Coordinates of C-alpha atoms and ligand atoms in Angstrom, one line a residue:
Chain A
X890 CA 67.0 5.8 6.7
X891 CA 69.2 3.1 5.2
X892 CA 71.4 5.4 1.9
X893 CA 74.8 5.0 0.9
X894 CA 76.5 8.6 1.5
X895 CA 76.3 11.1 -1.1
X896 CA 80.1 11.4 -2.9
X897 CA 82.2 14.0 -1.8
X898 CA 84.9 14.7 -4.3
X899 CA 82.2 16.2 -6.9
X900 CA 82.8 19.5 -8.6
X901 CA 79.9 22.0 -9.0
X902 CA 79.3 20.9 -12.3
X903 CA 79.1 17.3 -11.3
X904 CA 76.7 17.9 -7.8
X905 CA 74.5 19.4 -10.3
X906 CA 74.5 16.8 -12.8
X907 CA 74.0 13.8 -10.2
X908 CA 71.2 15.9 -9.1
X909 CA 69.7 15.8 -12.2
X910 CA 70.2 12.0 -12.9
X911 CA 68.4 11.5 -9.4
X912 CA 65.5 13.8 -9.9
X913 CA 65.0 12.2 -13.1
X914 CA 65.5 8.5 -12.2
X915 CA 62.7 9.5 -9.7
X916 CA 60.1 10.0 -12.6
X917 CA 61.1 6.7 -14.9
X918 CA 57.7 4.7 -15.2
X919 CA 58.3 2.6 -17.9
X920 CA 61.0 0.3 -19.3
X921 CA 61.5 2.6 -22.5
X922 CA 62.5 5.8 -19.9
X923 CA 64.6 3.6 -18.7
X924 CA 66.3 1.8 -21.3
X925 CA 66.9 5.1 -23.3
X926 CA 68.5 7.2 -19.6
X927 CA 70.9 4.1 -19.3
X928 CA 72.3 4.6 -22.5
X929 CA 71.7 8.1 -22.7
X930 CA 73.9 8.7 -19.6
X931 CA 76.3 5.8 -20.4
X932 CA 76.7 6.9 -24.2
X933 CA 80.5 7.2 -24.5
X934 CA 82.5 5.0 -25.6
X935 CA 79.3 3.3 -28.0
X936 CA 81.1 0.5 -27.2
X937 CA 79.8 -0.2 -23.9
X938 CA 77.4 -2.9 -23.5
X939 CA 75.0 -2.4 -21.0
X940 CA 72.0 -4.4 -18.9
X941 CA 70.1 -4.2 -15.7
X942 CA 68.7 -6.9 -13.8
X943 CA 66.2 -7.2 -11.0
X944 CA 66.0 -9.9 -8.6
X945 CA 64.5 -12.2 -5.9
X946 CA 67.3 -12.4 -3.3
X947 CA 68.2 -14.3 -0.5
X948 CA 69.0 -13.1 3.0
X949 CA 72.6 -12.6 1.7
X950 CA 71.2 -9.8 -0.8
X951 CA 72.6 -12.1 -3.8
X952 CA 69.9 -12.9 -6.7
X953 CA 68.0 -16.3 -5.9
X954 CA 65.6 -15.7 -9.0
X955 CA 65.9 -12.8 -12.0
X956 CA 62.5 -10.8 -11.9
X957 CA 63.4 -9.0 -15.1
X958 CA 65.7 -8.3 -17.7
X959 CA 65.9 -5.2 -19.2
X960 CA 68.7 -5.3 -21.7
X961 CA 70.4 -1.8 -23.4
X962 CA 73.1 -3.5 -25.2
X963 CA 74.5 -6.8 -24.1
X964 CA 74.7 -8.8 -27.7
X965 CA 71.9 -10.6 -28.1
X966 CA 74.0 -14.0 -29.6
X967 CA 75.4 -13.4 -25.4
X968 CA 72.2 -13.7 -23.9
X969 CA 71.1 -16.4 -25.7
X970 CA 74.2 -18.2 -24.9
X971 CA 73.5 -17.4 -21.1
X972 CA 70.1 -18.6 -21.1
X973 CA 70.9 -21.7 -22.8
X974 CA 73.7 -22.4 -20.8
X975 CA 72.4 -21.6 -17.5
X976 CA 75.0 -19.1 -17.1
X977 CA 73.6 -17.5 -13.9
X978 CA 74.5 -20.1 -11.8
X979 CA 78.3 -20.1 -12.8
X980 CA 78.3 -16.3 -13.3
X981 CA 80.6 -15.0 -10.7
X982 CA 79.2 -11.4 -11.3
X983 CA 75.5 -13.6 -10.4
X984 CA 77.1 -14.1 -6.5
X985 CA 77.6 -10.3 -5.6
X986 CA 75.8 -9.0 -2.4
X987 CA 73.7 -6.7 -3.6
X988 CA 74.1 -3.1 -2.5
X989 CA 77.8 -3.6 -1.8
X990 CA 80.2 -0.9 -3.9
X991 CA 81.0 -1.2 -7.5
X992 CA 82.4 -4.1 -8.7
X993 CA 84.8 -4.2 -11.1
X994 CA 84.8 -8.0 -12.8
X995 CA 88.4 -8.7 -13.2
X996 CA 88.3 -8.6 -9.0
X997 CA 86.4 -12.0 -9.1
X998 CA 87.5 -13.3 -12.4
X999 CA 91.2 -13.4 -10.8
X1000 CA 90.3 -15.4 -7.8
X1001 CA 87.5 -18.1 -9.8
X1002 CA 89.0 -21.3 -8.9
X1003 CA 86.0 -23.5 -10.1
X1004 CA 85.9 -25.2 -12.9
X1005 CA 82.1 -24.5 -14.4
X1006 CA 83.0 -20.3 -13.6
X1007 CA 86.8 -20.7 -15.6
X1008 CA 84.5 -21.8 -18.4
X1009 CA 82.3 -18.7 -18.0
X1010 CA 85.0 -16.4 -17.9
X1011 CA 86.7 -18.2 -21.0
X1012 CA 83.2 -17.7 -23.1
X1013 CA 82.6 -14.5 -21.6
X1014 CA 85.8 -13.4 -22.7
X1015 CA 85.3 -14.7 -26.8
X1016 CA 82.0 -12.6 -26.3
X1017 CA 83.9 -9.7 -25.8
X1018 CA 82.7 -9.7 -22.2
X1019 CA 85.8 -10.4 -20.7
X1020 CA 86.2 -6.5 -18.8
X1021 CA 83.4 -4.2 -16.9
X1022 CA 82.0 -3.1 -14.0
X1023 CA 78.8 -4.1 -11.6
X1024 CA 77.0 -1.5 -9.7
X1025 CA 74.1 -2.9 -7.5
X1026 CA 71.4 -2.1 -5.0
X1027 CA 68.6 -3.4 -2.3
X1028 CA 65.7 -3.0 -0.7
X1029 CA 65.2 -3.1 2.3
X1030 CA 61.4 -3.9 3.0
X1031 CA 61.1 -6.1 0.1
X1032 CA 63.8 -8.8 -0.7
X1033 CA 64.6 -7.5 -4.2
X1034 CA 67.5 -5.8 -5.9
X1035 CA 69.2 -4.6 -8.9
X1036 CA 72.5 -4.9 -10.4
X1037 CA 73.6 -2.3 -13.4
X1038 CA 76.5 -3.9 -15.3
X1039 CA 78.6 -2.2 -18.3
X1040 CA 81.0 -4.4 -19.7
X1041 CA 83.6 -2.5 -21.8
X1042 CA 87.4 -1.5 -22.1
X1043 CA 89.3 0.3 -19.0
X1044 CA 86.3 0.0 -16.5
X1045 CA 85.8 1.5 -14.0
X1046 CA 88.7 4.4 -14.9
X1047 CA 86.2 7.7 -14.6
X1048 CA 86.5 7.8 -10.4
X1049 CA 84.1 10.5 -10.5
X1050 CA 81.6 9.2 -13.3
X1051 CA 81.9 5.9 -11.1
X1052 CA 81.3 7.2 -7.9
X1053 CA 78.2 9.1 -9.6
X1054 CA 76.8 6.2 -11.0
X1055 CA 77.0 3.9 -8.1
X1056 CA 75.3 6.8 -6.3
X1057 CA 72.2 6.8 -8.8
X1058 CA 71.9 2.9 -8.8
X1059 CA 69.4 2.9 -5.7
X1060 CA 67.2 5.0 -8.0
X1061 CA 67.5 2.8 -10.6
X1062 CA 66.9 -0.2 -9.0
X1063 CA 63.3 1.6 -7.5
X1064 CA 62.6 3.0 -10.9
X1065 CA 63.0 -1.0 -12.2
X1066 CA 60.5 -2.7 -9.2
X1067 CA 57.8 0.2 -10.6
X1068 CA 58.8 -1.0 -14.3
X1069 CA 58.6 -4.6 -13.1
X1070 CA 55.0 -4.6 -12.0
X1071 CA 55.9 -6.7 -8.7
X1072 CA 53.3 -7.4 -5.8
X1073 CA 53.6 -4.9 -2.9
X1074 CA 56.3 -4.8 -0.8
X1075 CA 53.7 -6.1 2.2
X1076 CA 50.0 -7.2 1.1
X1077 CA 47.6 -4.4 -0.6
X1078 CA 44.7 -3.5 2.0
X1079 CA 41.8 -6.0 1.0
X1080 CA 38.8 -3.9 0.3
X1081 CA 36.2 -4.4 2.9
X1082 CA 32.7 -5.1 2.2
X1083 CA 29.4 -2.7 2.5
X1084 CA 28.8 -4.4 5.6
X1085 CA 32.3 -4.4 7.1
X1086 CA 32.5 -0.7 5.7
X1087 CA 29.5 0.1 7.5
X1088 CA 31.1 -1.4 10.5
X1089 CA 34.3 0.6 10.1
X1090 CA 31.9 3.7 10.0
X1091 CA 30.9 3.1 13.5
X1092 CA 34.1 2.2 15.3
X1093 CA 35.5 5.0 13.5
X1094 CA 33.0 7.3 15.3
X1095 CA 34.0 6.0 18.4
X1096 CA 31.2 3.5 19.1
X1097 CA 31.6 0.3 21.0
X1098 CA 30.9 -3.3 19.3
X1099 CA 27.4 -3.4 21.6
X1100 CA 26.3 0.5 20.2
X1101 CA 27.6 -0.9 16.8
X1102 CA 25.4 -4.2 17.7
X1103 CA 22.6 -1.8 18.3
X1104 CA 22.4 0.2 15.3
X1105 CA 22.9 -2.6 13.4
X1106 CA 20.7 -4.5 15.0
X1107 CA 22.6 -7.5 15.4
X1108 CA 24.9 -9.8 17.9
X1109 CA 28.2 -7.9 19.1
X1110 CA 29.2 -11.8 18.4
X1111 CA 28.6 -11.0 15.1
X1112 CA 30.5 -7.4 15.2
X1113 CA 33.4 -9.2 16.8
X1114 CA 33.6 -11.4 13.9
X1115 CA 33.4 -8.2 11.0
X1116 CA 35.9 -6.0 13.3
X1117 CA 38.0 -9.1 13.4
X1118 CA 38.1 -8.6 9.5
X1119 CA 38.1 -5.5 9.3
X1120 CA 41.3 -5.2 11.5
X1121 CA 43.0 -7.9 9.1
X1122 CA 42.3 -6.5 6.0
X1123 CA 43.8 -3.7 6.6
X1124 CA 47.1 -5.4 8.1
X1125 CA 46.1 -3.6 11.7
X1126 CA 47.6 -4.7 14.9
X1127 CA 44.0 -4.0 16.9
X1128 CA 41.0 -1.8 16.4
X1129 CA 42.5 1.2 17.4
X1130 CA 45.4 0.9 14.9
X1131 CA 42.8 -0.1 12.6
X1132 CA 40.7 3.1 13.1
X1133 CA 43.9 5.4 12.4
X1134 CA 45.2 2.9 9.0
X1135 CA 41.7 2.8 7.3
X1136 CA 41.1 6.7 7.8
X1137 CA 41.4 7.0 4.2
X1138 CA 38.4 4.7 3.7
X1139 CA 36.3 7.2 6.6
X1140 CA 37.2 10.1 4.5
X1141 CA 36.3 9.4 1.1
X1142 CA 33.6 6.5 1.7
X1143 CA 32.4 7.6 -1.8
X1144 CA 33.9 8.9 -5.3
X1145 CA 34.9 12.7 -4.5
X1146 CA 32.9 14.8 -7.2
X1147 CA 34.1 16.9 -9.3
Chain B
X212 CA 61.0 11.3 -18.8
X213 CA 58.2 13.7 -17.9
X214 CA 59.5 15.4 -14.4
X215 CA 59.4 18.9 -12.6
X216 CA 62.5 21.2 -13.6
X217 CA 64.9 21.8 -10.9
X218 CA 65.1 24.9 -9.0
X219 CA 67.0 27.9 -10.5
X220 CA 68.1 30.4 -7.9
X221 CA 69.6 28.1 -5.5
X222 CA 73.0 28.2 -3.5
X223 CA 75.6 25.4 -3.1
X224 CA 74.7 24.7 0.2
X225 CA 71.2 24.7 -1.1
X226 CA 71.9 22.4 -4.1
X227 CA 73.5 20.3 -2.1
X228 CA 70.8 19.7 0.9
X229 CA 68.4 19.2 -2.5
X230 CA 70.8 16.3 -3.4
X231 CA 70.3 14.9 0.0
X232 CA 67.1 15.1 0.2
X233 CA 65.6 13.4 -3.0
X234 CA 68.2 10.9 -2.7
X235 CA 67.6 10.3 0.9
X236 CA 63.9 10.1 -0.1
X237 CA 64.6 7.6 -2.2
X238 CA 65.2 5.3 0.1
X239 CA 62.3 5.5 2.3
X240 CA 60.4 2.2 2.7
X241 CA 58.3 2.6 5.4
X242 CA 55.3 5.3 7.0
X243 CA 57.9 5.6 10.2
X244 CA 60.7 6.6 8.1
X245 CA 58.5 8.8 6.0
X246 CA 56.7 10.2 9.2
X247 CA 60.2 10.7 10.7
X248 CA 61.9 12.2 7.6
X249 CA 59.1 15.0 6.7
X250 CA 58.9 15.9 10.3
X251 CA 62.5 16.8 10.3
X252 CA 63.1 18.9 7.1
X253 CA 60.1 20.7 8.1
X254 CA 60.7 21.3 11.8
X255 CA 60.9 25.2 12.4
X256 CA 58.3 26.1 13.2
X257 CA 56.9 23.2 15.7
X258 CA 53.7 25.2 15.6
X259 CA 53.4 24.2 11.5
X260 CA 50.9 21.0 11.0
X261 CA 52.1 18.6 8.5
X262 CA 50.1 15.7 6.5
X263 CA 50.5 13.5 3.6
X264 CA 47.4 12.1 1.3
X265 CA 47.7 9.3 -1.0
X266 CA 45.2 9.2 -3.5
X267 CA 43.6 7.5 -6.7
X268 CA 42.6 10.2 -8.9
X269 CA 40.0 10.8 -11.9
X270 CA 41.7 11.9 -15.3
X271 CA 42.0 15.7 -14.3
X272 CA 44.5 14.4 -11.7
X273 CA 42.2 15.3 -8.6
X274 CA 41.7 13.0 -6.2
X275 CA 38.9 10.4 -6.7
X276 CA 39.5 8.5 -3.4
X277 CA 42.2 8.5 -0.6
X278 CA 44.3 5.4 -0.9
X279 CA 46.5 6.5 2.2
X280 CA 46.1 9.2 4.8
X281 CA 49.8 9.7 6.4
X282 CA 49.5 12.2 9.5
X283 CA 52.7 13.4 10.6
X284 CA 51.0 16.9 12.3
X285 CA 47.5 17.6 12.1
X286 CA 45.4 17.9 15.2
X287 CA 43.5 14.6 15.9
X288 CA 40.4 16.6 16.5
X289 CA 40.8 17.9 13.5
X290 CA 40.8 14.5 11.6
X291 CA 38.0 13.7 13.4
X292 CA 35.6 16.1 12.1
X293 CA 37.4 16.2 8.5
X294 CA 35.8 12.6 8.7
X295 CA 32.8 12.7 10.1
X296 CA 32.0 15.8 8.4
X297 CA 33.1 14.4 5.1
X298 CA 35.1 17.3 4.8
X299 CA 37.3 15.9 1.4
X300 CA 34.5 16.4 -0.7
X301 CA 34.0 20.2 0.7
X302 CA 37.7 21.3 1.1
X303 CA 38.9 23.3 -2.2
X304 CA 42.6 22.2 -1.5
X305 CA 41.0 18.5 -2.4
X306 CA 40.1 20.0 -5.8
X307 CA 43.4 20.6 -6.8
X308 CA 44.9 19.0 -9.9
X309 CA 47.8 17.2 -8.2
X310 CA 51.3 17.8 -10.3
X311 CA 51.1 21.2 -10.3
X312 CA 52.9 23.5 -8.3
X313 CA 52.5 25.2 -4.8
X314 CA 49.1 26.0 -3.6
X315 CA 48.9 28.4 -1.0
X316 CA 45.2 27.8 0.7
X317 CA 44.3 31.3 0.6
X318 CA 44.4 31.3 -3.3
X319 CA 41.6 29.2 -3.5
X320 CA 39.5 30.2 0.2
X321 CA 39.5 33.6 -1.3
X322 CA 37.5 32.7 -4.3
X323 CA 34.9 29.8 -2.6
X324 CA 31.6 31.0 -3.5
X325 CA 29.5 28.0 -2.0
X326 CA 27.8 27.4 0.9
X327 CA 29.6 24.2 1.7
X328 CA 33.4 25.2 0.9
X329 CA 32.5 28.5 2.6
X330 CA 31.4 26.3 5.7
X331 CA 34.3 24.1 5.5
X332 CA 36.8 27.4 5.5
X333 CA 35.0 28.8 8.5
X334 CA 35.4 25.1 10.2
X335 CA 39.0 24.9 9.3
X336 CA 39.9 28.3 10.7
X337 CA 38.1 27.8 14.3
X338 CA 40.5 25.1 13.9
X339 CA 43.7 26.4 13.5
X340 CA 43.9 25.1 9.8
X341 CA 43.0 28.8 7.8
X342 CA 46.3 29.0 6.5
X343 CA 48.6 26.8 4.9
X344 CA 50.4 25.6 1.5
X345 CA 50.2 22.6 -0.7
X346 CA 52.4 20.5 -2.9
X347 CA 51.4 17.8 -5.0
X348 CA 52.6 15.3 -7.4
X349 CA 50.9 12.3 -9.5
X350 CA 52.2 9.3 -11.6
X351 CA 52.3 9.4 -15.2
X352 CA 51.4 5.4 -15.4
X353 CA 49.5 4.7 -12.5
X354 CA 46.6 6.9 -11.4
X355 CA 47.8 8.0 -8.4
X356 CA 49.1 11.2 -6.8
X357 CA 50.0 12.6 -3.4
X358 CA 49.4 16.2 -1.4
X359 CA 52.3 17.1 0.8
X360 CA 50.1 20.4 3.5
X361 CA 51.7 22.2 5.7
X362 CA 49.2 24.2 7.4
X363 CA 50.3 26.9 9.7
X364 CA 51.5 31.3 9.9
X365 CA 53.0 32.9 6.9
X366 CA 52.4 30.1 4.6
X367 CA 55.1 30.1 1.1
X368 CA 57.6 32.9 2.8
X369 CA 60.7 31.0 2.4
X370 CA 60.5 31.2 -1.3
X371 CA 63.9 28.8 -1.7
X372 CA 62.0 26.3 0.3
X373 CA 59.2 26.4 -1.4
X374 CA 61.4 25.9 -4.2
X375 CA 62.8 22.8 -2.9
X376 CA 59.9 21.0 -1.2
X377 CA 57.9 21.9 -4.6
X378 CA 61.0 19.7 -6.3
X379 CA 61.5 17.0 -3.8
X380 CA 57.6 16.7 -3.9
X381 CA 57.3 13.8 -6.3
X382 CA 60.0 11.5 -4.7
X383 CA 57.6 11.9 -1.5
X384 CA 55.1 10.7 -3.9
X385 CA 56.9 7.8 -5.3
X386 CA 57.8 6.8 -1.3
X387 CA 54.5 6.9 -0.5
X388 CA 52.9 4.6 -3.2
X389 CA 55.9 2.1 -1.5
X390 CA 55.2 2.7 2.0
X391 CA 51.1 2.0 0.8
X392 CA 51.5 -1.5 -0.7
X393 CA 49.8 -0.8 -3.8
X394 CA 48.7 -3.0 -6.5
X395 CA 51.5 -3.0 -9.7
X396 CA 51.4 -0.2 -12.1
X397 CA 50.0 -2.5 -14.5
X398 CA 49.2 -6.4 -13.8
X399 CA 52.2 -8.6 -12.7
X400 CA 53.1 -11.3 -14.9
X401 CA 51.1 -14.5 -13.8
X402 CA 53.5 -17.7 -12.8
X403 CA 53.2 -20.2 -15.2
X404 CA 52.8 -23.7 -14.8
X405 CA 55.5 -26.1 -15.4
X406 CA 53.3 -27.2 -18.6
X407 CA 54.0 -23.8 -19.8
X408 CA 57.7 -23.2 -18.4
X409 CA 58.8 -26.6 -20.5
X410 CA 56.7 -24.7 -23.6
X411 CA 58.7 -21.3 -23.0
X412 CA 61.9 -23.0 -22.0
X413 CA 61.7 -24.3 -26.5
X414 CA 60.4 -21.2 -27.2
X415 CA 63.5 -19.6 -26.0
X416 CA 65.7 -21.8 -27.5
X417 CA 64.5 -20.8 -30.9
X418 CA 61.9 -24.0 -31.6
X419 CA 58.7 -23.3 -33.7
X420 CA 55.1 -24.9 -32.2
X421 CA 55.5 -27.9 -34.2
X422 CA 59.0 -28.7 -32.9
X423 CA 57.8 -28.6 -29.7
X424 CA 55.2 -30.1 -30.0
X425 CA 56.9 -33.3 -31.9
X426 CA 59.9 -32.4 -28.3
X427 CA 57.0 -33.0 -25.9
X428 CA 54.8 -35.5 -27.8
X429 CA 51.4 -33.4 -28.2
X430 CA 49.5 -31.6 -30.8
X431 CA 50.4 -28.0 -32.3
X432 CA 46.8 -27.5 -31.1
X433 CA 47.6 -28.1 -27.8
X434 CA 51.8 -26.3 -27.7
X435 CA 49.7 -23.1 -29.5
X436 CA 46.9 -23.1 -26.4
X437 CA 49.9 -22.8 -23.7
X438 CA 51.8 -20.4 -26.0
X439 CA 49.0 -18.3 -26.0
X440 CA 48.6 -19.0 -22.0
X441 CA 52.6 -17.8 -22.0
X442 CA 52.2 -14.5 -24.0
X443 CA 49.2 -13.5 -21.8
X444 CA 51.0 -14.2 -18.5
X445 CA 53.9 -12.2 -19.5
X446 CA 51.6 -9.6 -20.7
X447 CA 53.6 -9.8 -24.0
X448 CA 52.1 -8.7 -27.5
X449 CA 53.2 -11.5 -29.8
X450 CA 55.0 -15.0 -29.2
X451 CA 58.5 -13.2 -29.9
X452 CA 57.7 -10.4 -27.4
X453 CA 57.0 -13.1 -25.0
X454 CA 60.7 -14.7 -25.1
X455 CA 62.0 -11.0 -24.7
X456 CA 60.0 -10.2 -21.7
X457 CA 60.5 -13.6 -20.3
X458 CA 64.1 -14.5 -20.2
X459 CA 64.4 -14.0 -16.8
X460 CA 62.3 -17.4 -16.6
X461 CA 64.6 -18.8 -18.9
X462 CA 67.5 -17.3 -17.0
X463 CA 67.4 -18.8 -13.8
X464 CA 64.9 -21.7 -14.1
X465 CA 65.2 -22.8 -10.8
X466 CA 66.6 -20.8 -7.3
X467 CA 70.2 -19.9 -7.8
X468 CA 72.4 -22.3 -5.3
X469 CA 74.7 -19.8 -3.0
Ligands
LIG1618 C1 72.8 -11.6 -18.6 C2 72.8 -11.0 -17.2 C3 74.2 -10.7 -16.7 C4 74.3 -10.0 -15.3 C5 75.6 -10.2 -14.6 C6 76.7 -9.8 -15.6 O1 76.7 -8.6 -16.1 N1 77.6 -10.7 -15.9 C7 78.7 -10.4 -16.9 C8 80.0 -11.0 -16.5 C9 80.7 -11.3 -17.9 O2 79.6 -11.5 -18.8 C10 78.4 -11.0 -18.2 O3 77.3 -11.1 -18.8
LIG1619 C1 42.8 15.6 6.1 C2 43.4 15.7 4.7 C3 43.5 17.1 4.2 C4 44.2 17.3 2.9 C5 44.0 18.6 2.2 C6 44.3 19.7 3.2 O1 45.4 19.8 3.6 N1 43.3 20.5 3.5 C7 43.4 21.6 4.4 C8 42.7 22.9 4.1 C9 42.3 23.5 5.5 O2 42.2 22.4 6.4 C10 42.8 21.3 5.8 O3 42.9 20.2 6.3

């Protein structure tokens, strides 16, 4: 399994209280949760301004297309400015590699040579953006990612608070695909029909197409052609794999009663 | 945030390998990885017999129908007749209300008064299946919920463990509806066409109906039928609520050059 390492400077206090951020990232559902534990756990100073954003990425891990904003407290006069004036493509915060370590902004701003991202970090700046920090993380099955920014004064000065945070991002980027409502990571099964089900049935008794052909009564040229589907729906590799995948269809053909 | 309390008793090597383990969880992407990862943290003894169900439940949180049947241990044999027998809708343990905590099999074996359960018990126990425990978790958004058995001797003994699988639980849970390809929560937003992108794109720039539609040379009738179109597809409440939830559209546009 693919995890940056747990931090290891924490005090007993702090071990717990990452625990606790973790357990409970784990449960966010919905974009209020989520909203509200951001600036819950980012509350001090309140004048911290603070947004996630989840994104298509390239095979660099950098954001190709936002999927969603969710916004805490960046000023909404600065996101309208970004929208309008296609700030993301000038945005030098907008080429991080996703799932790298914190990033403080000041590290990039320093080295932006061109002249579209010195305008960005000139408007930025009279939008009291000018200073903060990027946390960000990746999947790895599905090309999408997140990056947590707070923009603010001294960031990036709490080593410990830092180091805890960067550590909870991966959760907060997994609670933000469920929030999202994105397709699967790899097609959804496709439900099979009564006749394919009753198909399934059989090889999933251990019958052979001609005995399924039999009690069906009809060509194993036609039970080629419904395994065939069968095997595809449910992204199987060949019958047999098919037969272990779709064992949750053999086992509750019906609605359980209760 | 509606979540399981952590565990109480523990010891700092124990809140640490709890650490570890949610946030190692958290990362899990595919059935191999979460195949791999419960077979280790539940290794001693090699005799136990280890399975995860995914299911859509009914609104006690019970299982309506399996969405995903994850073997990591169970007998094949086993499976087989659970199957073929349609065991799910005779075992008691598939009667629990998922999100609540341990269930130790013999809790409920030891109060089965009918014929069928009491058959089932009898079935499982030739099997080497008459003991065991059960964790379970469900979503709070999405009816869906996983069991986490571990069938084998001296079910629940190592009460600290118990404590900790019981907590780690719903992360296995959340890894599972990944690993399962799922349909969203709720529906995804639907893309919208580049009628409706050129609408949204004025929306979000703060121009009423008739501005836009005097921009792009067309009736109001016509800019208020895509508007509508636009706060559907972004599963918005209100034309306002639509430029909120879509300025990641308005964002990046078009694929972000890199
Ligand atoms: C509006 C989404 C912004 C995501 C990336 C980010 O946080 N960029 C900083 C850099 C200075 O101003 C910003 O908005
Ligand atoms: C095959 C899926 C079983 C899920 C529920 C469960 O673990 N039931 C136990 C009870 C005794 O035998 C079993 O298989």
């Amino acid at each position: 399994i693919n995890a940056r390492p747990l931090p290891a400077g924490l005090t007993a206090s702090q071990q717990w209280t990452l625990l606790e951020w973790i357990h409970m990232a784990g449960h966010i559902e919905t974009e209020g949760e989520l909203k509200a534990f951001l600036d819950n756990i980012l509350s001090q100073a309140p004048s911290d301004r603070i947004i996630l954003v989840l994104g298509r990425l390239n095979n660099q891990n950098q954001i190709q297309r936002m999927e969603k904003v969710l916004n805490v407290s960046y000023p909404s006069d600065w996101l309208n400015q970004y929208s309008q004036e296609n700030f993301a493509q000038h945005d030098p915060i907008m080429r991080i590699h996703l799932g790298q370590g914190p990033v403080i902004w000041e590290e990039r701003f320093s080295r932006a040579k061109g002249s579209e991202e010195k305008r960005f970090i000139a408007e930025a700046s009279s939008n009291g953006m000018g200073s903060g920090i990027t946390f960000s993380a990746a999947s790895d099955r599905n090309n999408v990612g997140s990056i947590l920014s707070i923009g603010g004064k001294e960031p990036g000065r709490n080593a410990a608070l830092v180091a805890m945070l960067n550590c909870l991002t991966p959760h907060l980027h997994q609670a933000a695909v469920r929030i999202a409502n994105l397709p699967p990571a790899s097609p959804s099964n496709m439900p099979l029909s009564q006749r394919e089900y009753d198909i399934f049935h059989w090889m999933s008794r251990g019958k052979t197409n001609w005995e399924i052909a039999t009690i069906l009564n009809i060509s194993e040229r036609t039970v080629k052609f419904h395994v065939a589907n069968v095997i595809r729906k449910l992204n199987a590799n060949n019958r047999t794999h098919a037969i272990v995948l779709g064992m949750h269809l053999a086992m509750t053909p019906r609605e359980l009663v209760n």
